[PDB]
Design a protein around this motif. Structure first.
Motif, PDB file in Angstrom:
ATOM      1  N   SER A   9       8.568  13.882 -28.775  1.00 48.23           N
ATOM      2  CA  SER A   9       9.478  14.337 -29.886  1.00 48.23           C
ATOM      3  C   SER A   9      10.539  13.324 -30.660  1.00 48.23           C
ATOM      4  O   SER A   9      10.799  12.285 -30.116  1.00 48.23           O
ATOM      5  N   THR A  10      10.979  13.676 -31.914  1.00 50.76           N
ATOM      6  CA  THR A  10      11.873  12.838 -32.453  1.00 50.76           C
ATOM      7  C   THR A  10      13.342  12.731 -31.860  1.00 50.76           C
ATOM      8  O   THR A  10      13.701  11.638 -31.635  1.00 50.76           O
ATOM      9  N   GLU A  11      13.694  13.966 -30.978  1.00 54.21           N
ATOM     10  CA  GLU A  11      14.793  13.784 -30.296  1.00 54.21           C
ATOM     11  C   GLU A  11      14.692  12.917 -29.011  1.00 54.21           C
ATOM     12  O   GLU A  11      15.784  12.015 -28.878  1.00 54.21           O
ATOM     13  N   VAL A  12      13.648  12.835 -28.253  1.00 51.79           N
ATOM     14  CA  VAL A  12      13.555  11.992 -27.320  1.00 51.79           C
ATOM     15  C   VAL A  12      13.614  10.446 -27.742  1.00 51.79           C
ATOM     16  O   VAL A  12      14.061   9.659 -27.435  1.00 51.79           O
ATOM     17  N   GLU A  13      12.784  10.195 -28.911  1.00 45.57           N
ATOM     18  CA  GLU A  13      12.534   8.996 -29.431  1.00 45.57           C
ATOM     19  C   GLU A  13      14.052   8.484 -29.736  1.00 45.57           C
ATOM     20  O   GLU A  13      14.202   7.193 -29.637  1.00 45.57           O
ATOM     21  N   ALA A  14      14.851   9.271 -30.270  1.00 45.91           N
ATOM     22  CA  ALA A  14      16.426   8.730 -30.744  1.00 45.91           C
ATOM     23  C   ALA A  14      17.106   8.830 -29.617  1.00 45.91           C
ATOM     24  O   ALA A  14      17.948   7.599 -29.663  1.00 45.91           O
ATOM     25  N   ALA A  15      17.046   9.591 -28.473  1.00 42.57           N
ATOM     26  CA  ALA A  15      17.900   9.363 -27.267  1.00 42.57           C
ATOM     27  C   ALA A  15      17.292   8.256 -26.650  1.00 42.57           C
ATOM     28  O   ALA A  15      18.216   7.709 -25.920  1.00 42.57           O
ATOM     29  N   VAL A  16      16.038   7.909 -26.534  1.00 40.97           N
ATOM     30  CA  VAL A  16      15.678   6.559 -25.889  1.00 40.97           C
ATOM     31  C   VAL A  16      16.347   5.248 -26.886  1.00 40.97           C
ATOM     32  O   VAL A  16      16.758   4.442 -25.958  1.00 40.97           O
ATOM     33  N   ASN A  17      16.333   5.323 -28.076  1.00 42.60           N
ATOM     34  CA  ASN A  17      17.183   4.261 -28.735  1.00 42.60           C
ATOM     35  C   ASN A  17      18.367   4.167 -28.111  1.00 42.60           C
ATOM     36  O   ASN A  17      19.131   3.029 -28.188  1.00 42.60           O
ATOM     37  N   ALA A  62      16.904  -1.933 -20.268  1.00 47.19           N
ATOM     38  CA  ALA A  62      16.572  -1.845 -21.630  1.00 47.19           C
ATOM     39  C   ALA A  62      15.319  -2.389 -22.233  1.00 47.19           C
ATOM     40  O   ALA A  62      14.432  -1.519 -23.007  1.00 47.19           O
ATOM     41  N   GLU A  63      14.614  -3.319 -21.855  1.00 48.25           N
ATOM     42  CA  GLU A  63      13.460  -3.754 -22.297  1.00 48.25           C
ATOM     43  C   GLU A  63      12.310  -2.850 -21.569  1.00 48.25           C
ATOM     44  O   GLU A  63      11.253  -2.645 -22.346  1.00 48.25           O
ATOM     45  N   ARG A  64      12.162  -2.257 -20.277  1.00 48.12           N
ATOM     46  CA  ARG A  64      11.464  -1.186 -19.955  1.00 48.12           C
ATOM     47  C   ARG A  64      11.524   0.105 -21.097  1.00 48.12           C
ATOM     48  O   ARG A  64      10.490   0.520 -21.247  1.00 48.12           O
ATOM     49  N   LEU A  65      12.751   0.364 -21.436  1.00 47.12           N
ATOM     50  CA  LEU A  65      12.728   1.589 -22.273  1.00 47.12           C
ATOM     51  C   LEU A  65      12.191   1.124 -23.540  1.00 47.12           C
ATOM     52  O   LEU A  65      11.233   1.920 -24.326  1.00 47.12           O
ATOM     53  N   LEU A  66      12.129  -0.202 -23.899  1.00 48.33           N
ATOM     54  CA  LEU A  66      11.708  -0.510 -25.743  1.00 48.33           C
ATOM     55  C   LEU A  66      10.299  -0.573 -25.362  1.00 48.33           C
ATOM     56  O   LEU A  66       9.493  -0.195 -25.939  1.00 48.33           O
ATOM     57  N   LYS A  67       9.859  -1.136 -24.221  1.00 47.88           N
ATOM     58  CA  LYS A  67       8.367  -1.027 -24.047  1.00 47.88           C
ATOM     59  C   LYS A  67       7.416   0.132 -23.983  1.00 47.88           C
ATOM     60  O   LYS A  67       6.713   0.605 -24.612  1.00 47.88           O
ATOM     61  N   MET A  68       8.412   1.278 -23.263  1.00 51.44           N
ATOM     62  CA  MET A  68       7.791   2.755 -23.163  1.00 51.44           C
ATOM     63  C   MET A  68       8.020   3.283 -24.630  1.00 51.44           C
ATOM     64  O   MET A  68       6.923   3.816 -25.077  1.00 51.44           O
ATOM     65  N   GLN A  69       9.052   3.077 -25.254  1.00 52.59           N
ATOM     66  CA  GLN A  69       9.333   3.353 -26.826  1.00 52.59           C
ATOM     67  C   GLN A  69       7.857   3.107 -27.618  1.00 52.59           C
ATOM     68  O   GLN A  69       7.353   3.912 -28.092  1.00 52.59           O
ATOM     69  N   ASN A  70       7.510   1.724 -27.538  1.00 50.56           N
ATOM     70  CA  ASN A  70       6.282   1.289 -28.230  1.00 50.56           C
ATOM     71  C   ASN A  70       4.986   2.022 -27.616  1.00 50.56           C
ATOM     72  O   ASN A  70       4.065   2.277 -28.399  1.00 50.56           O
ATOM     73  N   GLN A  71       4.931   2.256 -26.320  1.00 45.09           N
ATOM     74  CA  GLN A  71       3.713   2.934 -25.879  1.00 45.09           C
ATOM     75  C   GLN A  71       3.570   4.179 -26.145  1.00 45.09           C
ATOM     76  O   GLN A  71       2.217   4.813 -26.568  1.00 45.09           O
ATOM     77  N   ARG A  72       4.522   5.014 -26.499  1.00 44.55           N
ATOM     78  CA  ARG A  72       4.490   6.492 -26.883  1.00 44.55           C
ATOM     79  C   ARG A  72       4.456   6.812 -28.519  1.00 44.55           C
ATOM     80  O   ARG A  72       4.245   7.664 -28.938  1.00 44.55           O
ATOM     81  N   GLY A  73       4.592   5.345 -29.055  1.00 47.20           N
ATOM     82  CA  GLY A  73       4.515   5.500 -30.570  1.00 47.20           C
ATOM     83  C   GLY A  73       5.619   5.732 -31.502  1.00 47.20           C
ATOM     84  O   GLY A  73       5.534   5.814 -32.542  1.00 47.20           O
ATOM     85  N   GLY A  74       6.961   5.557 -30.560  1.00 44.27           N
ATOM     86  CA  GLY A  74       8.379   5.460 -31.361  1.00 44.27           C
ATOM     87  C   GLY A  74       8.555   4.300 -31.948  1.00 44.27           C
ATOM     88  O   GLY A  74       7.852   3.350 -31.767  1.00 44.27           O
ATOM     89  N   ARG A  75       9.832   4.240 -32.620  1.00 44.70           N
ATOM     90  CA  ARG A  75      10.002   3.144 -33.397  1.00 44.70           C
ATOM     91  C   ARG A  75      11.496   2.599 -32.692  1.00 44.70           C
ATOM     92  O   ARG A  75      12.440   3.250 -32.737  1.00 44.70           O
ATOM     93  N   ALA A  76      11.459   1.593 -32.072  1.00 43.56           N
ATOM     94  CA  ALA A  76      12.818   1.082 -31.779  1.00 43.56           C
ATOM     95  C   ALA A  76      13.693   0.776 -32.582  1.00 43.56           C
ATOM     96  O   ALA A  76      13.264   0.235 -33.940  1.00 43.56           O
ATOM     97  N   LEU A  77      15.023   1.168 -32.633  1.00 44.35           N
ATOM     98  CA  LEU A  77      15.931   0.939 -33.650  1.00 44.35           C
ATOM     99  C   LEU A  77      17.216   0.509 -32.953  1.00 44.35           C
ATOM    100  O   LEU A  77      17.471   0.994 -32.052  1.00 44.35           O
TER     101      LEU A  77
END
Ligand SMILES: [Au+]
Ligand SMILES: [Au+]
Ligand SMILES: [Au+]
Ligand SMILES: [Au+]
Ligand SMILES: [Au+]
Ligand SMILES: [Au+]
Ligand SMILES: [Au+]
Ligand SMILES: [Au+]
Ligand SMILES: [Cl-]
Ligand SMILES: [Cl-]
Ligand SMILES: [Cl-]
Ligand SMILES: [Cl-]
Lengths: 173, 173, 173, 173
Positions: A9-17, A62-77
């Motif tokens: 979801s876009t919601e999870v993507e944003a909450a990850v960032n 933080a780096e683990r979260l960023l790696k996961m963001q990329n693995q799911r196709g989200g965009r780090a911001l």
């Protein structure tokens, strides 16, 4: 959207960032804590090392979260990183209290993100948090609580002595 | 009665089963003592480890008694195990006092069982107790007495400090 | 309440203490099973070892639960431990049937605790059970079912022979 | 009397010599048992080895008694050794029953000698028996009882099969 993105979801993507921002903020706090205890007029080497090691751990989160963001196709911001809440951190007791407060806020952010994942039916997110973050946090907060208890018992009537002894005989140097 | 049973009174058989119950009770007490000192608001790791190691030792004593019961052709009979006498154990001093009381009761039970064996002319029982229990108990009670003395000397006017120092410099972590 | 306690309901805390009691009860049952198969008039060494190893495993489960209770800021509370349901355990078949019944009750208690955790939104509890207990239990119950099947096939018309052969060629000695 | 003899009654000295005779008798019985199971028409190698090993153990017990007799200043006196009670020993079950009977008689002789030592206030004799004989005997009689139980369970309706299986899968070859 990504060619790989699925059930994310876009919601999870944003909450990850946002969580990345929190973890990096926490890392920066620990860097400031660590160097404060290295000042010639504080000079508690073991306290400095305890906080510096946490700065690294939070960066790693933080780096683990960023790696996961990329693995799911989200965009780090990335956003601005606010400086730490204090420039001077008082005693070891004051510092450990501030650290436990900080960890509780990270923990609550993790739990909030887990609840969002559960509401969004995103089991990969839930797993990821359960596997790499939730127990790490519980264990750390317990360690901190154990440290606060020992520091407090050591204050007694001879605070300086107690702070030296805790650094020398509990913390590693 | 057993094809193997020889010179083994019903009285000794029953007293063995009761001793097993005592040892398992003692084990359970030490498990509770151990975990109390692991609480975040007690947090005396070396005290926790001292009591947890005793929980294992008392379990081991029970298992040795049960093995012996079988080797003599008696029949193990288990009863309910009463919970420990306290839910919270106070200070290290309070806990060590309770432990020495407990050990003295085990010791007296051993001595009572030895006297029964002697009255029943059961030299294998006497040997078994002399070889595996009576000295172990004497050595442990002496260790406890040495610990109580050092803890008491450390109370002075700064109890918290003394409790930390005893955990750090006598107990193992 | 604890300085460390976060998202940890009183309900889960109490259910954890009850589960500890169940696991210790189960441990005690297995100790009795183990020693029964060591009697000179039962004498199935491999069956004794299978049950004694389970006594240790269930003790270990209780200790993991107690450690977790402390890490979350809950307070361990111990109750009386009821003796095992039987003093004599019959054949290997009878014993394995009783063991599978016992394991199913532990499993159901785990599942009930998982459901409570899910209702309370306590992902650390859910994780903990999923990681350290639920699969261990599924694997054990499957092993037991495999053993029951082999024991039953061996009864045939020569029960004694079948019980000896199962002990010798499946169980470890 | 010896230049070294101290607190060593004539009664104990004589009872020691009689015990030596019993142990050597027992050794001779086991030699006969061992060779019977080596006959081409019995041919149970593991049963032969079990009894031959016991022949050695009983010889060793006699030699320990003789050494002790000399250490206390008593005088070894040898008598005729009566042949074993049987020339043929029947089945493995028959043989193990005869062995347990024999061991019980040795055990009772040990206990009788211990009681004499206690009546004579000879703690070195009591110790010697407790340390080198009484537990060895208890352990052996338990092993025998375990073996009898397994052999009996194996008789069922196929005695020959059961005797082969016990030799192959319990006894060592
Ligand atoms: Au979830
Ligand atoms: Au989920
Ligand atoms: Au005695
Ligand atoms: Au005695
Ligand atoms: Au859940
Ligand atoms: Au959950
Ligand atoms: Au004696
Ligand atoms: Au004596
Ligand atoms: Cl700011
Ligand atoms: Cl009670
Ligand atoms: Cl009950
Ligand atoms: Cl004769």
């Amino acid at each position: 959207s990504s060619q790989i993105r699925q059930n994310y979801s876009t919601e999870v993507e944003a909450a990850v960032n946002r969580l990345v921002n929190l973890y990096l903020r926490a890392s920066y706090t620990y860097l400031s804590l660590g160097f404060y205890f290295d000042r010639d007029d504080v000079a508690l080497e073991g306290v400095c090392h305890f906080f510096r090691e946490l700065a690294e751990e939070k960066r790693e989160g933080a780096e683990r979260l960023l790696k996961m963001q990329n693995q799911r196709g989200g965009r780090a911001l990335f956003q601005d990183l606010q400086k730490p809440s204090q420039d001077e951190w008082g005693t070891t007791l004051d510092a450990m209290k501030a650290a436990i407060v900080l960890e509780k806020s990270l923990n609550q952010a993790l739990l909030d993100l887990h609840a969002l994942g559960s509401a969004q039916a995103d089991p990969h997110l839930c797993d990821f948090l359960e596997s790499h973050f939730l127990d790490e946090e519980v264990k750390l907060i317990k360690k901190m609580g154990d440290h606060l208890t020992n520091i407090q018992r050591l204050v007694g009537s001879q605070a300086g002595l107690g702070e030296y002894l805790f650094e020398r005989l509990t913390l590693k140097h």
